[PDB]
Design an enzyme around this catalytic site. Structure first.
Site, PDB file in Angstrom:
ATOM      1  N   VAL A   1      47.986  71.553  39.320  1.00 35.01           N
ATOM      2  CA  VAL A   1      46.675  71.006  39.676  1.00 35.01           C
ATOM      3  C   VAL A   1      46.412  71.012  41.203  1.00 35.01           C
ATOM      4  O   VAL A   1      45.328  71.379  41.631  1.00 35.01           O
ATOM      5  CB  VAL A   1      46.505  69.591  39.106  1.00 35.01           C
ATOM      6  CG1 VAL A   1      45.224  68.940  39.610  1.00 35.01           C
ATOM      7  CG2 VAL A   1      46.468  69.672  37.597  1.00 35.01           C
TER       8      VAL A   1
ATOM      9  N   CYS B   1      52.871  69.897  36.020  1.00 37.38           N
ATOM     10  CA  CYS B   1      51.437  69.987  36.013  1.00 37.38           C
ATOM     11  C   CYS B   1      50.815  69.478  37.330  1.00 37.38           C
ATOM     12  O   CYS B   1      49.788  69.976  37.726  1.00 37.38           O
ATOM     13  CB  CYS B   1      50.850  69.325  34.768  1.00 37.38           C
ATOM     14  SG  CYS B   1      51.349  67.619  34.423  1.00 37.38           S
TER      15      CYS B   1
END
Ligand code: ICS
Ligand code: ICS
Ligand SMILES: [Cl-]
Ligand SMILES: [Cl-]
Ligand SMILES: [Fe+2]
Ligand SMILES: [Fe+2]
Lengths: 477, 522, 522, 477
Positions: free
Chosen positions: C156, C152
């Site tokens: 991001v 993640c």
């Protein structure tokens, strides 16, 4: 099917047999005429089985040990002979009881003398006497012993009566010799009779000179209910709500004392006529106790039975009878309302032992079902006399049906459901015909009484209407 | 009473207050029952070493045996032959029982006939029953072979099967060349497994004794396989699978796996599959014959060695790692086929599972029972797993077998606390699991009553049953399982370790009491 | 204290009186614990309908989820390719967790690398991590393919996988021809199954998008099979077995069964088996592509349809009777191969088992959870068995899927009392099994804590867990099982009916209380 | 193996690497010389992992949530961010506790904010505030909340400190923001430090002005024991048998109140130096509380530790210390007598996190075993300084070992046993090397203290000597 079609079916099926077997089997197959009262004009029964034809019958040991004696909970029953018979019959029959097994109750245990070659060659009476002492040491709370003879005992000339007398005297213990060897008779039936006579001769008279039991006018015994899945309990409850006192149950959940107390009752209530009519007749002869047949399968029969029993007593019992009937009315009506529309019009073939092939017909009819064939392993013509009025015109009757016959009849008749035993179950399921075991209740029940009817209905529906039955044909053909 | 929406069967119906009260009144009024304090006192005494000593002194009484009678095994053997009807000469009650006993284990039809001898046959013997019975059976059920055994009545009366079958053929009741192999199967000798041996040897004799002169050992390039009394479908299947994977030509002699597993497709098949008559006739031409369960195939072995001249190998049942290895290496030697990559990998996967599960298996204590070969294979595999087979019970075992098992126990430190018992029954076993409590029982459904008894003493004394053996009547479809080969070992390992972990979860499920050890990961 | 010949681990060591007293002293002295009456009061409240209503109003809090994150599924997909290293671009903490999660379920090594991006990469991105990561991984672990997904952090920060891999090749960190398929796998979209779909579609694109010109549908006479996220070895195996028995040419695309089941033979094999690069390259030449788990293969489907021009059939997961039948009939249609006698017979054996076990299954009520395709197949088979799947929970399900399951429920009277829940977790499920108590749960190991909770209310309220799904961490070797096809249905049926009978035996084990119904035969 | 052999082993292994990796990894691999006291002459540690090499390390969230905070039993710990991290770490670590889970204790539960795309795009602080209210409604007996940040939180610029302050004030509740995002640091290690600072800043000072605690001269806290399989309980028991009062356990079976009471103790007993030296230093600085390292692995270390601890108190505690040692003497002696002959001379390689790779060496030596290689995932040089004197001359040390390295080292060294984690276990078993999990204790334990040593010995024996290890080679190969 018409009478003529069923007659034709019988003849077609009989074509496979050699002449002697054909001629014999023709006598055991009939098309019902409910106008007939003497079944000896219609069908032969209680004869030897034809060799090699795959009878479904058992033997006299099954009828004595398996059926009559085995359920008596606080006695130890010895399967006397080689190891097989006691092992195959260990806990096969769901004759329910309350007790502490191995301590005060012994029903699901297998006690045996496990005959070896030396016992055959020299006799088993010395072994039996030693075995009795070992039972007494290891099971001190047993309240009596029975000796259930297997095939070799009489063949080798053993004297179990002598052993039972001598040991019974030595130990101040009821020890009952039962000559139920499987070579005797033709089926389970003679075992019942042998067993009844053994109860008569060795147990029933023990309290003949004892005046201490306080009797009442409402004392009864349930005769011939072996409490399959609790059947006798769901019968007893109704009798006692009706104001009666059930002194004894023969022999489901039965104790030796309640058997000994039975000569003190006012009325013997006979469910299984075939297995217990003998001792019922004896008790009428000796003690003046009347007996009457009844039927606790389904609400119609159960209501009729309660009323007929109550009529033997006073107004107070007849009033309680109507109270019982009123209590259970909404309960069985709710069962019918749920299940009858699921079962209406469906056709059943039965094959069972000596009572249920006729006794359960009313319960089926209470669900809108039709019994289109029925028959018995080992019934006598007095059973068939009771059957022909319960079955429809032109329905099929079969006595000691062969495996072949049962399969071929089913293929033509195409019943929606079959009710029979464990040796039959898996055959008919493979044919795509819903099957319910009508000996063991397929591990369900009770089926007696009002509470039993609810379970019976649930069971017939769960099986007849199960989604599995639409799945036997692969969709690719 | 019933509520139509939630109907109660016997459990829990009879726990309703009105039934409870009724049953109390029955007891108090009419049963003259021993007081509960006396019942408790006697129960307690039956759990003691003093009671165990009296129990083990029994000479005449048997309680809760762990064996059955010969003809049961003859029937199973017979079922394994193509279009063959098992036929038991003697009393029909026996056949109702044999069929029902197998029906309940396999949840399948079990076809078998009697010739319905009655008391009248004591005078003259069962010859006419044999004549009519053979004729009737053949006409009605259309078998290609009828395999004849006996009930104890026939044995006591002394009926000569050979003569009676010969006279049946002489007098035209069955054709001269129709196969009617036979064996005497007295229930008062040995057990059900002995009946299997006797039946098999009779069938073997029937098809080969008179025709030996043209036979040449090895000429058909196959190995015969004799499975013995076997009630797991997976066991017939795994043997055939392994041999096929190796490219080994074989003949499985007595193979009921088809007839004991027919599809539910709208027809009943009385017969399916099975060893062919051609296979039995040709069997002496094999390279050799392997017995999967040698401890109940002693008569068969003498016939195969004495008449077929096969040098039957000294192999244990192929159970566990070492004995499956040994079976495969011997088959390789005989056949000339190497053990293939597929089987080598399967072996390694079993070993992987052993390494993965060893910490939970280690030191676990078992009571176990069954037939001799199954028991000794289970013992061997338990030792391979680092488990302790402390109570080893084989009711139908013999002294030579016990010496063999004691020798296996001696070859491992995990055997140090183990004893082998022969001639003892499940009432004997019950005492042992009270006085020298193990972690688990491995046995058949009759063990449930021992588990029941142990729980009554208390939860901390309960010995859970793990169902492996015969008969298994209270669970469904366990007869599809496997106990032989690497596949069987994998199945057994999995069942054992998860039984351990299920019990541990039960013992650690108590909120704020024992659930500190209720681990997600084990 | 310990006694050396019976050493106690945590259970039951801490039940010794000295530990109990010590723990009481710790609590009383220092923990300032809520009184036990208050604990009991609150526990009771958590079992209520009032609490359930509050529980179902949650919008922000999730408790005990029944899903994981995307890259977990990408890793499992990648493992199914020959000599392929899963590589997750981003943070290394994630890879430790993915590996351990699968280690604990399979009890096997699980190989996967990270490129160990740290905080510093937020300025500049993870390009250098990719360059060194790919070079290092190739050199050290010698894969033939590296299949790249993301954590993640990488999502991001917005790292462009395509560009980073292209620049890695441009600057010589790995050869231009070396296969490095990739997929973006954000943990904040969908779930682990979505990661599988994304990874697979990326691999399919890598090997086919640019070489479509020479492809002809059906020219290789095979059917492609895409299994999706699958954690039962038996499921890969049964599909291959059935297709082989039918004589159907096939390519199983993502096949980890070898690498998740290597033998313990003295060497570690980092790679084993798997779908070949040749199979992926040639896959557009298949007749068609069958998706075994369509409800998480939607992106794959659009690619296969849009680019390969395969007319992907509308098939449910092949679970239960009807949907296995449908699978086989569709495979027959596509391939031109008839359904063989072996499979017809297997089907009939399943139906036989259904007839044999129906009376114990009928009306039994289940709560269940898992991934969408598994759940709907379980529901369908439960209906076929005459069972009631009353609480159907799929945390990662969607509205369209729910509509499909509600339609299946409508097609059967056994669906009448059933509700499907999406977006809800095992804390929601806990309430349902208190307020509308079923007979059993069918679920993964996280269900054990719900069973624990239900027992604490009382034995009569306990809902036993039947372990089917992922992850299963507290039993050994259940990952070897099968849930697809007739074999899987036979396994599930057996597990269900015997779970029922085990519980019934427990409830009827009480001496002189409930053992009137402790039947030998069921 | 000689020093030169081990040196050439390292060089051989590193030949597979590209130059940059090779040069880095060379610095993390060393041959022990117990004469060295400055490990910064010998080995580099606590650096980034090289990309693509299959480090065994985790992240700062593992070190904060998984290790330090997660065990605290009466608080609710929120895994804040997407669903993965909390799910993989749910009940993976056996940090044992006594409580009523879901009611007053919450350790094995997974609470998460389950971030979706909208949460990434617009931030999660509004979701966090709502989540807190939902926790309060559904879990009213929680005694505090922590917010364990996952990767996205800091990356997207959320302000969990504001939410924690505002909501904590509103609810009069301790709510602790923990910035343990996995992008921070290089391993679990920085997670420990972040977590310690969050305890300091948000919990530890609550009772600074509260003088109501009934302190005694014998009050201690166990600092850095996470009660794996009950390890802290089998330590506590000895400390209290020695006459001490264990006010707190950090953090195995730990409660928020016992953490808040810790500043009232007389002595901090530090087991895990790596994870909790930070807070121990803070407590000495702020409260004047001394701290000391100890070791409860095996009898030799346990006895030394008990004596060293007792020496900080008076004669009464010193006397009780010797009583304790005398009590357990026969118990551990029996363990040694049984297991040491089964294990003598056997060689072990270890690879664990930050403490155990040195701390367990004495226990192995108490069974006659030799630790021939050891190393850590995330230790610092102060750990290596403590290691070099515990390991033998010319043994192998490895910092942040790669998967490749560990395999190749084991192939050459051929240890009799390996002690490492779950990602290693199945690799080495397939190679035929007995393997014990030295994080989870392979679902066994405790291993701390005298009672733990018995289990440790049993376990090493059951695995090293298991019959399975003789069976990997097929007899036809
Ligand atoms: S006793 Fe008889 S065969 Fe009347 S031997 Fe048989 S428990 Fe049947 S039809 Mo099994 S005459 Fe009872 C019977 Fe009926 S064992 Fe049960 S079901 S009502
Ligand atoms: S806290 Fe640390 S990795 Fe000191 S993060 Fe790790 S429960 Fe290890 S060597 Mo798992 S510094 Fe504890 C540890 Fe040691 S989780 Fe446990 S075993 S003694
Ligand atoms: Cl019993
Ligand atoms: Cl939990
Ligand atoms: Fe069946
Ligand atoms: Fe494994």
């Amino acid at each position: 099917m018409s009478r003529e079609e069923v007659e034709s079916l019988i003849q077609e099926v009989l074509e496979v047999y050699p002449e002697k077997a054909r001629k014999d089997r023709n006598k055991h197959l009939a098309v019902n005429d409910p106008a007939v009262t003497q079944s000896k004009k219609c069908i032969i029964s209680n004869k030897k089985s034809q060799p090699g034809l795959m009878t479904i019958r058992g033997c006299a040991y099954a009828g004595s040990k398996g059926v009559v004696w085995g359920p008596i909970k606080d006695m130890i029953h010895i399967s006397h002979g080689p190891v097989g018979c006691g092992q195959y019959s260990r806990a096969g029959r769901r004759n329910y009881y309350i007790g502490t097994t191995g301590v005060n109750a012994f029903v699901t245990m297998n006690f045996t003398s496990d005959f070896q070659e030396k016992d055959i060659v020299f006799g088993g009476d010395k072994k039996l006497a030693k075995l009795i002492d070992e039972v007494e040491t290891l099971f001190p709370l047993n309240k009596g012993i029975s000796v259930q003879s297997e095939c070799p005992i009489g063949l080798i000339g053993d004297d179990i009566e002598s052993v039972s007398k001598v040991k019974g005297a030595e130990l101040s213990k009821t020890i009952v010799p039962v000559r139920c060897e499987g070579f005797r008779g033709v089926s389970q039936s003679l075992g019942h009779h042998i067993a009844n006579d053994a109860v008569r001769d060795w147990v029933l008279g023990k309290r003949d000179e004892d005046t201490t039991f306080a009797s009442t006018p409402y004392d009864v015994a349930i005769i011939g209910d072996y409490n399959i899945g609790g059947d006798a309990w769901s019968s007893r409850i109704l009798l006692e709500e009706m104001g009666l006192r059930c002194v004894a149950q023969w022999s489901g959940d039965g104790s030796i004392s309640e058997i000994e107390l039975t000569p003190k009752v006012k009325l013997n209530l006979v469910h299984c006529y075939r297995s217990m009519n003998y001792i019922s007749r004896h008790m009428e002869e000796k003690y003046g106790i009347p007996w009457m047949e009844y039927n606790f399968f389904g609400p119609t029969k159960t209501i009729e039975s309660l009323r007929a029993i109550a009529a033997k007593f006073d107004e107070s019992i007849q009033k309680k009878c109507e109270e019982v009937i009123a209590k259970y009315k909404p309960e069985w009506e709710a069962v019918v309302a749920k299940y009858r529309p699921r079962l209406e019009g469906k056709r059943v073939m039965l094959y069972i032992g000596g009572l249920r092939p006729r006794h359960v017909i009313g319960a089926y009819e209470d669900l809108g079902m039709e019994v289109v064939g029925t028959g018995y392993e080992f019934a006598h013509n007095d059973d068939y006399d009771r059957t022909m009025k319960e079955m429809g015109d032109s329905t099929l009757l079969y006595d000691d049906v062969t495996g072949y016959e049962f399969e071929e009849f089913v293929k033509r008749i195409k019943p929606d459901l079959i009710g029979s035993g464990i040796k039959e179950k898996f055959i008919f399921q493979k044919m795509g015909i819903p099957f319910r075991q009508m000996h063991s209740w397929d591990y369900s029940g009770p089926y007696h009484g009002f509470d039993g009817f609810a379970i019976f209905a649930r069971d017939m529906d769960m099986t007849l209407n199960n989604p599995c039955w639409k799945k036997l044909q692969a969709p690719w053909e | 009473s019933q509520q139509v929406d939630k109907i109660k069967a016997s459990y829990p119906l009879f726990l309703d207050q009105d039934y409870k009260d009724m049953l109390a009144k029955k007891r108090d009024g009419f049963e003259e029952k021993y007081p509960q304090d006396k019942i408790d006192e006697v129960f307690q005494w039956t759990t003691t070493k003093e009671y165990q000593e009296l129990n083990f002194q029994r000479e005449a009484l048997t309680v809760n045996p762990a064996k059955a009678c010969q003809p049961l095994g003859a029937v199973l053997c017979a079922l394994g032959f193509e279009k063959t009807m098992p036929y038991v000469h003697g009393s029909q009650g026996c056949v109702a029982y044999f069929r029902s006993y197998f029906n309940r284990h396999f949840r399948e039809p079990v076809s078998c006939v009697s010739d319905s001898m009655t008391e009248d046959a004591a005078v003259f013997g069962g010859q006419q029953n044999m004549k009519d019975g053979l004729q009737n059976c053949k006409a009605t059920y259309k078998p290609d072979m009828i395999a004849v055994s006996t009930t104890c009545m026939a044995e006591v009366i002394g009926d000569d099967l050979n003569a009676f079958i010969n006279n049946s053929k002489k007098e035209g009741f069955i054709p001269d060349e129709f196969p009617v192999p036979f064996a005497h199967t007295p229930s008062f000798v040995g057990s059900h497994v002995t009946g299997w041996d006797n039946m098999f040897e009779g069938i073997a004799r029937y098809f080969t004794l008179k025709s030996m002169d043209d036979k040449v050992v090895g000429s058909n390039k196959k190995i015969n396989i004799v499975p013995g009394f076997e009630t797991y479908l997976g066991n017939f299947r795994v043997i055939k699978r392994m041999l096929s994977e190796m490219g080994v030509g074989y003949s499985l002699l007595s193979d009921p796996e088809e007839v004991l597993d027919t599809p539910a497709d709208g027809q009943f098949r009385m017969y399916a599959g099975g060893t062919t008559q051609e296979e039995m006739k040709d069997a002496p031409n094999a390279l050799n014959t392997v017995l999967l369960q040698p401890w109940h195939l002693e008569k068969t072995k003498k016939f195969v060695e004495g008449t077929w001249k096969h040098e039957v190998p000294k192999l244990n049942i192929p159970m566990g790692l070492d004995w499956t290895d040994e079976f495969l290496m011997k088959v390789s030697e005989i056949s000339g086929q190497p053990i293939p990559a597929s089987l080598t990998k399967e072996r390694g996967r079993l070993v992987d599972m052993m390494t993965d599960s060893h910490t939970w298996l280690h030191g676990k204590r078992f009571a176990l029972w069954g037939d001799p070969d199954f028991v000794m294979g289970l013992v061997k595999f338990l030792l391979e797993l680092g488990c302790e087979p402390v109570h080893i019970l084989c009711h139908n075992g013999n002294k030579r077998w016990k010496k063999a098992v004691d020798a296996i126990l001696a070859a491992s430190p995990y055997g140090k606390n183990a004893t082998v018992y022969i001639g003892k029954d499940l009432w004997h076993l019950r005492s042992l699991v009270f006085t020298d409590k193990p972690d688990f029982m491995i046995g058949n459904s009759y063990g449930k009553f021992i588990q029941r008894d142990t729980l009554h003493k208390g939860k901390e004394f309960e010995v859970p049953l793990i169902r492996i053996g015969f008969p298994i009547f209270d669970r469904h479809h366990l007869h599809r399982s496997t106990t032989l080969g690497y596949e069987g070992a994998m199945q057994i390992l999995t069942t054992l370790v998860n039984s351990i972990l299920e019990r541990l979860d039960e013992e650690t499920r108590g909120m704020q009491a024992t659930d500190y050890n209720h681990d997600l990961v084990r």
